Ligand binder design. Structure first.
Ligand code: LRG
Ligand code: LRG
Lengths: 258, 244
C-alpha cells in the first residue's frame, strides 16, 4: 500500500496538531536562537528569583509543575487516542487499559521535544531551565529530571519530526501486550497497520538513516522502563522525605481512597 | 485563656497565609451590594471536571502547608503525617468549597465567575450528579454561619483525626486533637454565644464529611466501569491507582 498508508499518516498528523499545542517544530524553532522573543533562561538561583516576572520553594514549584502538566497531558493524549481509527470501537475497558499505560510513555516522548543537552523549555516556551541547574538541586530533585534528559538526548539524535512522532505515539498507544487487555487481536490488527504506516513514513522521510524503524521499536521498550524508574523515585520520596510539601500526596490519595 | 485563645489565633493567622480565598472574601462577592467587579455568571462536562482535577492539585499544597503549621504535626512519625493528610484533604476541600456556595450557585476562578446550581444539575448523565450533593451539604453547613476564625480550628480538628485507617501512633495525635477540640469549643462559646449546641453540630459535620468523600469516589467508580467515552474518565486517577 501507499495511498491508504499515506492517508492514515496524514490523518494522524492532522489530529496530532489539533490535540497537542506545543509541537516539536515549534519547540525547535524556539531552541534555535529564530528570534521571535527569546526564552528567559533559568540558570542559577539569582536568575531563578527573576523568573517570577516574565512568565506564568523551587523544588515544590518544579514538582507541582509536573503534576499540573500530567493533568493537561491526559486530556490531550485521550483526544489524540480517540482519533486513531478503530480505537473507540474497542471494548471500553481495553481503551482504558491502553491509555493508562500509554499516557506517561507519551509524556516522556513529547518532553524530549522540549529538551536538548543543555536544558528544557518551560511555560510553553517562555523559559529555559538549565540541565545543570536542575542537577544542582536538593536531594530529591537533583536526580529527577536527569534520566529524562538521558533518554531525550539519544531520542532526539534520531531527528524525528512531528509527522514521524504522530505515528510513533499511535503505535505505542495501540500496544497489544499491555497487562489486563481483554481482546488482543483487534488491538494488534490496528497496530500492524500503524507499524506499516510508520515504516513507510520513515523510509520516505529518512533516506540518510539506517535501521530507524528498528531503533524506534527499541525506544518504545525503553520508555516502559523510564516510566517504572520515575514511579520508583517517587516511592523513595514517599518513604523518606521528611517534608510533606515534597510528597506526591494526591497520587497517594487516589491510590488508597479512590 | 492564654494557651487556647493563643492557639486559636495562631491557627487563624496560618489559615489566612495558606488559603487565598477566605469565606469573608467570598461572602463579600456573593453580596452584589459589595460591587468591586461583579462575577461573570455561567465540551462542558469535560471542562468543568478537568477544572476540579486542577483544583485538587492546588488544594493539596495549600492544605499541606496549613497542616504543617498545626503545632505538633511535623513532629509526628512521617507515616502518620501522610495518613492524616491523605484522609483530610478531600474533607477540607468540600468544607472550604461550601464557603463559595449558596443555594443558587458556586463562585469559581477566585471569585471571577459564578456557575449556577441549576446549570450544574442540568448537565448530561454522568455530570449532573457531581455537584448537587456538595450544594446540599453546603447549604446546611453555611446555615451554621461559621467565620474564618471558626473554620481554621474546625479544619485543624479534622486533620488531627486519631481514627484514620493505618495510623501507627494514635496517642500523640489524640493529645493534639483534644486541645484543638477545646480551642474550638471555647471559640464557639465566645464567637457564637447565641448558638447553643453548635459544637456538637460541628462534630456531626466532621462525620458527614467522610460520607461526602465516599459518595464522590463512588460516582467516579461508576464512571470508570460504565462510561463509553474516555474523555469522561478520570484517567489520571486510574493511572495513579493502578501503576503508581
Ligand atoms: O508522575 C507524573 O504524573 C509526573 C510526570 C511528569 C514528569 C516530568 C514532567 C512532566 C510530567 O511526574 C510527577 C513528578 C513529581 C510530582 C510531585 C508533585 C508534588 C510533590 C511531589 C512530587 C508529581 C508528578
Ligand atoms: O476528586 C477530586 O479530586 C476532585 C475533587 C473536587 C471536587 C469539586 C471541586 C474541586 C475538587 O473532583 C474531581 C471530579 C471529577 C474529575 C474528573 C476529571 C476528568 C474526567 C472525569 C472526572 C476529577 C476530579
Amino acid at each position: 500500500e501507499s495511498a491508504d498508508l499515506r492517508a492514515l499518516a496524514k490523518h494522524l498528523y492532522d489530529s496530532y496538531i489539533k490535540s497537542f499545542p506545543l509541537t516539536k517544530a515549534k519547540a525547535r524553532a524556539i531552541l534555535t536562537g529564530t528570534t521571535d522573543k527569546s526564552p528567559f533562561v533559568i540558570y542559577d538561583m539569582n536568575s531563578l528569583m527573576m523568573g517570577e516576572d516574565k512568565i506564568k520553594e523551587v523544588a515544590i514549584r518544579i514538582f507541582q509543575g509536573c503534576q499540573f502538566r500530567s493533568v493537561e497531558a491526559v486530556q490531550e493524549i485521550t483526544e489524540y487516542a480517540k482519533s486513531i481509527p478503530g480505537f473507540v470501537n474497542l471494548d471500553l475497558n481495553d481503551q482504558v487499559t491502553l491509555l493508562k499505560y500509554g499516557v506517561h510513555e507519551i509524556i516522556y516522548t513529547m518532553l524530549a521535544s522540549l529538551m536538548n543537552k543543555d536544558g528544557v523549555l518551560i511555560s510553553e516556551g517562555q523559559g529555559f531551565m538549565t540541565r545543570e541547574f536542575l542537577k544542582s538541586l536538593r536531594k530529591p530533585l537533583g536526580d529527577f529530571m536527569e534520566p529524562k534528559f538521558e533518554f531525550a538526548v539519544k531520542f532526539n539524535a534520531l531527528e524525528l519530526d512531528d509527522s514521524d512522532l504522530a505515528i510513533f505515539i499511535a503505535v505505542i498507544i495501540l500496544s497489544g501486550d499491555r497487562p489486563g487487555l481483554l481482546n488482543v487481536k483487534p488491538i494488534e490488527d490496528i497496530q500492524d497497520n500503524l507499524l506499516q504506516a510508520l515504516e513507510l513514513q520513515l523510509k520516505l522521510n529518512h533516506p540518510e538513516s539506517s535501521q530507524l524503524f528498528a531503533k524506534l521499536l527499541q525506544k518504545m521498550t525503553d520508555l516502559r522502563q523510564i516510566v517504572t524508574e520515575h514511579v520508583q523515585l517517587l516511592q523513595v520520596i514517599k518513604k523518606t522525605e521528611t517534608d510533606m510539601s515534597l510528597h506526591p500526596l494526591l497520587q497517594e490519595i487516589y491510590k488508597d481512597l479512590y
